[PDB]
Design a protein around this nucleic acid. Structure first.
Length: 121
DNA sequence: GGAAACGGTGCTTTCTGGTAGATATGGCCGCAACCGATAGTTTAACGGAAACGCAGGTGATATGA
């Protein structure tokens, strides 16, 4: 599961005393994105890297793509693809701000896997 | 009624030469024993065959990387 990867990445990055908060927020991000269907058939190191990036953002701490792709085996373009995908989810730009909002429900999930075919038709 | 004198020769005896076995000493011939050597296992440990697993000549279905 992604929990092991985020723990190892946080341990190897050694960001600050905030490691626990970063890992806990990354767990919540990974769980929410999994409930949004954005994890089936996809790389564990990619979800872990993106969840840490989002957790760091929620914790107001800055990091370069080069450090998160040093611990994770996935390429920078994969992190950016997943970041943009997260940003297109239901109410993302309306909930990605401060105060850690309680919105966790799935609603209707519309991943690229079938939506690319819906666009092609 | 018989024993004493002594002639007959049957039966026996050593001096000896014969028969011929015996062996202290001797010289060959070859058995009993040792130190010697050739051949033996099966494995140190890794050199070997047979035993062993992934590639490359197409194709190419998915949706992520």
């Amino acid at each position: 599961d992604p929990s092991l990867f985020i723990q190892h990445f946080a341990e190897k990055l050694d960001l600050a005393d905030k490691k626990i908060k970063v890992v806990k927020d990354a767990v919540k991000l990974a769980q929410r994105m999994s409930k949004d269907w954005m994890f089936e058939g996809r790389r564990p190191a990619g979800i872990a890297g993106a969840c840490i990036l989002l957790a760091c953002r929620m914790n107001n701490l800055r990091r370069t793509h080069t450090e998160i792709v040093a611990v994770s085996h996935v390429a920078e373009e994969t992190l950016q693809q997943r970041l943009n995908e997260f940003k297109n989810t239901k109410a993302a730009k309306l909930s990605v701000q401060k105060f850690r909002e309680n919105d966790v429900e799935d609603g209707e999930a519309r991943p690229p896997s079938f939506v690319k075919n819906r666009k092609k038709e």
